[PDB]
């Protein structure tokens, strides 16, 4: 996260770290959406142009975390993955259209003060909240600057940006399965996700029921926190039929 702040303890109990076994290292972020299901970006797990294609046994998920590097004894839980599911129409060839994957855990994680799932939007919550100007929140342990590692989880709140602005800000072909967020060049405030935050949740708090909904997933962007550029997110509601489909099994 670029130009954000340290998260408070328990502020984001759905935040998940995808952890590499081999060189023990952070791969990506992710979110917990039930006791057995974790949501991430497809490109964290599968990216052929760079030869990346993870198997279950290569990874661990670390849930309940705050500190990036330290093993958080009695707090975090580390789970193995049963199964990885990539959206069948994830477009790694071109623009990362439908950048989304589900991971089924080997055993249900036990919820606690530091571990609790986020909600997934219904059509109505999506329609009411996913509007330009309205702000959400992005969290992760990725880069503090474009070219730099945080000791703890970082957080930033960002406004959803109008589709014409998003499209005009980039050379990439943007689809309906994407939205962008970030401040406009003059608006004065800054902030962005960056490498390492990938797969983390973009969430909004409902003013109707006080619950946090995950609306987006950290996907891509031209650099990090550049003026007139914006972070791009997988539109989770648009892909929810697929999410539900997989979970019905």
């Amino acid at each position: 996260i670029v130009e954000g702040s340290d998260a408070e303890i328990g502020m984001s109990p759905w935040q998940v770290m995808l952890f590499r076994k081999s060189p023990q290292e952070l791969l990506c972020g992710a979110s917990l959406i039930s006791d057995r299901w974790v949501l991430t970006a497809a490109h964290c797990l599968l990216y052929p142009p760079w030869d990346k294609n993870f198997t279950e046994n290569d990874l661990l998920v670390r849930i309940g975390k705050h500190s990036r590097t330290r093993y958080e004894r009695n707090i975090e839980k580390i789970s193995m993955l049963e199964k990885i599911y990539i959206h069948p129409r994830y477009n790694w060839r071109e623009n990362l259209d439908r950048d989304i994957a589900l991971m089924k855990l080997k055993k249900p994680v036990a919820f606690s003060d530091y571990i609790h799932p986020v909600c997934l939007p219904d059509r109505e919550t999506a329609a009411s909240l996913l509007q330009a100007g309205y702000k959400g929140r992005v969290t992760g342990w990725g880069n503090l600057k474009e070219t730099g590692q945080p000791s703890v989880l970082q957080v930033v709140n960002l406004p959803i940006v109008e589709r014409p602005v998003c499209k005009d800000s980039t050379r990439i072909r943007i689809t309906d399965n994407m939205f962008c967020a970030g401040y406009k060049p003059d608006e004065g405030k800054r902030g962005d996700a960056c490498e390492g935050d990938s797969g983390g949740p973009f969430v909004m708090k409902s003013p109707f029921n006080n619950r946090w909904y995950q609306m987006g997933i950290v996907s891509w962007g031209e650099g990090c926190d550049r003026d007139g550029k914006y972070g791009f997110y997988t539109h989770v509601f648009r892909l929810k039929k697929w999410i539900q489909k997989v979970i019905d099994q």
Binding site: F19, Q24, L26, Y71, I78, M80
Partner: peptide
């Protein structure tokens, strides 16, 4: 510089 995690997790 990630602290070693318990071996039980593989």
């Amino acid at each position: 510089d990630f602290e070693e995690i318990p071996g039980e997790y593989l």
